[PDB]
Design an enzyme around this catalytic site. Structure first.
Site, PDB file in Angstrom:
ATOM      1  N   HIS A 296       0.841  -1.190   0.000  1.00 45.17           N
ATOM      2  CA  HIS A 296       0.000   0.000   0.000  1.00 45.17           C
ATOM      3  C   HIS A 296       0.874   1.235   0.000  1.00 45.17           C
ATOM      4  O   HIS A 296       0.364   2.343  -0.117  1.00 45.17           O
ATOM      5  CB  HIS A 296      -0.913   0.067   1.240  1.00 45.17           C
ATOM      6  CG  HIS A 296      -1.687  -1.189   1.515  1.00 45.17           C
ATOM      7  ND1 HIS A 296      -1.189  -2.212   2.298  1.00 45.17           N
ATOM      8  CD2 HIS A 296      -2.931  -1.574   1.144  1.00 45.17           C
ATOM      9  CE1 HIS A 296      -2.083  -3.181   2.379  1.00 45.17           C
ATOM     10  NE2 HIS A 296      -3.150  -2.819   1.688  1.00 45.17           N
TER      11      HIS A 296
ATOM     12  N   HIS B 120       8.776   6.183   4.195  1.00 46.75           N
ATOM     13  CA  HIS B 120       7.566   5.706   3.504  1.00 46.75           C
ATOM     14  C   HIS B 120       6.374   6.635   3.742  1.00 46.75           C
ATOM     15  O   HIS B 120       6.438   7.452   4.634  1.00 46.75           O
ATOM     16  CB  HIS B 120       7.221   4.298   3.963  1.00 46.75           C
ATOM     17  CG  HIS B 120       6.983   4.166   5.439  1.00 46.75           C
ATOM     18  ND1 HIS B 120       7.990   3.871   6.338  1.00 46.75           N
ATOM     19  CD2 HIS B 120       5.855   4.316   6.178  1.00 46.75           C
ATOM     20  CE1 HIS B 120       7.481   3.802   7.556  1.00 46.75           C
ATOM     21  NE2 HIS B 120       6.190   4.072   7.492  1.00 46.75           N
TER      22      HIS B 120
ATOM     23  N   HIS C  19       2.065   7.822   4.147  1.00 49.25           N
ATOM     24  CA  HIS C  19       0.693   7.422   4.485  1.00 49.25           C
ATOM     25  C   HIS C  19      -0.289   8.571   4.102  1.00 49.25           C
ATOM     26  O   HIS C  19      -0.040   9.725   4.409  1.00 49.25           O
ATOM     27  CB  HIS C  19       0.564   7.065   5.999  1.00 49.25           C
ATOM     28  CG  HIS C  19       1.354   5.866   6.467  1.00 49.25           C
ATOM     29  ND1 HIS C  19       0.852   4.582   6.446  1.00 49.25           N
ATOM     30  CD2 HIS C  19       2.568   5.772   7.073  1.00 49.25           C
ATOM     31  CE1 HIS C  19       1.736   3.746   6.968  1.00 49.25           C
ATOM     32  NE2 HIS C  19       2.791   4.442   7.361  1.00 49.25           N
TER      33      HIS C  19
ATOM     34  N   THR D 261       2.702   1.082  12.606  1.00 49.45           N
ATOM     35  CA  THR D 261       1.298   1.319  12.285  1.00 49.45           C
ATOM     36  C   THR D 261       0.754   0.300  11.271  1.00 49.45           C
ATOM     37  O   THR D 261      -0.449   0.269  11.005  1.00 49.45           O
ATOM     38  CB  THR D 261       1.061   2.746  11.772  1.00 49.45           C
ATOM     39  OG1 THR D 261       1.820   2.963  10.580  1.00 49.45           O
ATOM     40  CG2 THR D 261       1.453   3.763  12.821  1.00 49.45           C
TER      41      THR D 261
HETATM   42  N1  LIG Z   1       4.130   2.978   9.663  1.00 49.04           N
HETATM   43  S1  LIG Z   1       5.446   2.535  10.543  1.00 49.04           S
HETATM   44  O1  LIG Z   1       5.065   2.441  12.005  1.00 49.04           O
HETATM   45  O2  LIG Z   1       6.528   3.559  10.372  1.00 49.04           O
HETATM   46  C1  LIG Z   1       6.038   0.938   9.972  1.00 49.04           C
HETATM   47  N2  LIG Z   1       5.427  -0.256  10.094  1.00 49.04           N
HETATM   48  N3  LIG Z   1       6.095  -1.327   9.571  1.00 49.04           N
HETATM   49  C2  LIG Z   1       7.293  -1.099   8.985  1.00 49.04           C
HETATM   50  N4  LIG Z   1       8.176  -2.057   8.368  1.00 49.04           N
HETATM   51  S2  LIG Z   1       9.380  -1.541   7.381  1.00 49.04           S
HETATM   52  O3  LIG Z   1       9.154  -0.097   7.028  1.00 49.04           O
HETATM   53  O4  LIG Z   1       9.387  -2.382   6.105  1.00 49.04           O
HETATM   54  C3  LIG Z   1      10.950  -1.710   8.215  1.00 49.04           C
HETATM   55  C4  LIG Z   1      12.128  -1.524   7.517  1.00 49.04           C
HETATM   56  C5  LIG Z   1      13.355  -1.656   8.169  1.00 49.04           C
HETATM   57  C6  LIG Z   1      13.392  -1.976   9.521  1.00 49.04           C
HETATM   58  C7  LIG Z   1      12.211  -2.163  10.223  1.00 49.04           C
HETATM   59  C8  LIG Z   1      10.988  -2.032   9.573  1.00 49.04           C
HETATM   60  S3  LIG Z   1       7.516   0.598   9.146  1.00 49.04           S
HETATM   61 ZN   LIG Z   2       4.548   4.264   8.389  1.00 50.08          ZN
END
Ligand SMILES: NS(=O)(=O)c1nnc(NS(=O)(=O)c2ccccc2)s1
Ligand SMILES: [Zn+2]
Ligand SMILES: NS(=O)(=O)c1nnc(NS(=O)(=O)c2ccccc2)s1
Ligand SMILES: [Cl-]
Ligand SMILES: [Cl-]
Ligand SMILES: [Zn+2]
Lengths: 221, 201
Positions: free
Chosen positions: B55, B80, B82, B147
């Site tokens: 997403h 990334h 949202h 999240t």
């Molecule tokens: N939306 S949020 O809380 O920043 C995330 N939730 N899951 C994630 N996984 S990820 O971005 O692929 C990632 C990448 C590297 C290390 C740890 C996690 S980030």
């Molecule tokens: Zn995020």
């Protein structure tokens, strides 16, 4: 199946092994107790205690405990958390910048939605504490508990998010840990540690992940 | 059949999305105010991998840029996006947010003047990471979670209240790289999160 305190597998490292309910005792990321050492200095706490004859005074699950009907409340963030019971830990489980006291007591609260608020305050070797006598002095028409007199009038407190220190080690617990010790006599302590059957009920310090802790001050009356 | 109230049933791996007592995002509405006291420090650098996943648009790089918090080193991994922004600051709507994954740093985007820092996204571009964050920032800090599934808890979240600026076309253009589908997790039940308020340069 029965859980406990010391080294053997039925032990602290292995709560999680004892039940699938106690999994979080291992998997949890906000487990208490901890040693409180890095916090921020900066209140919306309000007190509704009343002198009450307990509903029940009993040793349960390794600990001495007194229960009440819900006439007593604590108010946090515009929410009322009702007192259900008060129990004891010896030695003190939470550490404040590496600070054990021989005894602590825990005021257990829940709100309308069932969210939890708990108050901890430690005890010192010192003069006799009268508020203790209705618990020990008397076992059976029950005697008054000085809920309005129990806590310091003025307190510095630490607030942070953590967990239960006894199974199921549930997280989402609102913890308030008073810096001000209350004072208890030495034989009250010996008698009460012996009434908790003299096996230390202090959960070892849990892992610290840079928990946000605040220090503050309030009037309890 | 792949949704948010349902993340916990998709896998036993993902139950903490429901069993968790400190899940993000939530509504930042009760806080504690505090002094110039902290430890938070930024060693960002202009840095030149980009792919659409789960997403979300994400840009990751080599471990060259890191952050100092309370004496611990956190290396930045990716950024990334949202839409709309997931975390709420006093009910604050926002069309877009960004997550600096290290401790995760969030900051929202609002419709206005074009953001030059966005265009390298819309042999990769230099990204002015050093130009990307406000030199002075106000943030909300607390412990929370990822999240998105697996919703791992123990996340040091820092939420900067200060908005950045996006054009409408930029606003529109990367929603399409997210396939014009909203990737915002609803607000989770909160159990008296301790939030601290502060500011940093
Ligand atoms: N939306 S949020 O809380 O920043 C995330 N939730 N899951 C994630 N996984 S990820 O971005 O692929 C990632 C990448 C590297 C290390 C740890 C996690 S980030
Ligand atoms: Zn995020
Ligand atoms: N040591 S601690 O975290 O305060 C507790 N651990 N288990 C407790 N059980 S209890 O006080 O009887 C209780 C009573 C009502 C709701 C939840 C818990 S308190
Ligand atoms: Cl304690
Ligand atoms: Cl966000
Ligand atoms: Zn207890």
């Amino acid at each position: 199946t029965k859980w406990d305190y010391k080294n053997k597998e039925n032990g602290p490292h292995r709560w999680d092994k004892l039940h699938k309910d106690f999994e979080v005792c291992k998997s949890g990321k906000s487990q208490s107790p901890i040693n409180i050492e890095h916090y921020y200095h900066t209140a919306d706490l309000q007190f509704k205690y009343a002198a009450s004859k307990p509903k029940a005074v009993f040793f349960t699950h390794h600990t001495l405990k007194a229960s009440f009907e819900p006439t007593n409340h604590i108010n946090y963030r515009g929410h009322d958390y009702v007192l259900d019971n008060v129990h004891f830990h010896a030695p003190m489980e939470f550490l404040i910048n590496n600070k054990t006291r021989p005894l602590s007591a825990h005021f257990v609260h829940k709100d309308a939605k069932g969210r939890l608020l708990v108050l901890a305050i430690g005890f010192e070797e010192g003069k006799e504490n009268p508020n203790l006598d209705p618990i020990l002095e008397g076992i059976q028409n029950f005697k008054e508990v000085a809920l309005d007199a129990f806590l310091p009038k003025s307190i510095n407190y630490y607030h942070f998010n953590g967990s239960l220190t006894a199974p199921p080690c549930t997280e989402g617990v609102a913890w308030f840990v008073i810096e001000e010790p209350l004072e208890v006599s030495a034989k009250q302590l010996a008698e009460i540690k012996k009434r908790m059957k003299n096996s230390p009920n202090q959960r070892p310090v849990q892992p610290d992940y840079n928990t946000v802790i605040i220090k503050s001050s309030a009037e309890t009356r």
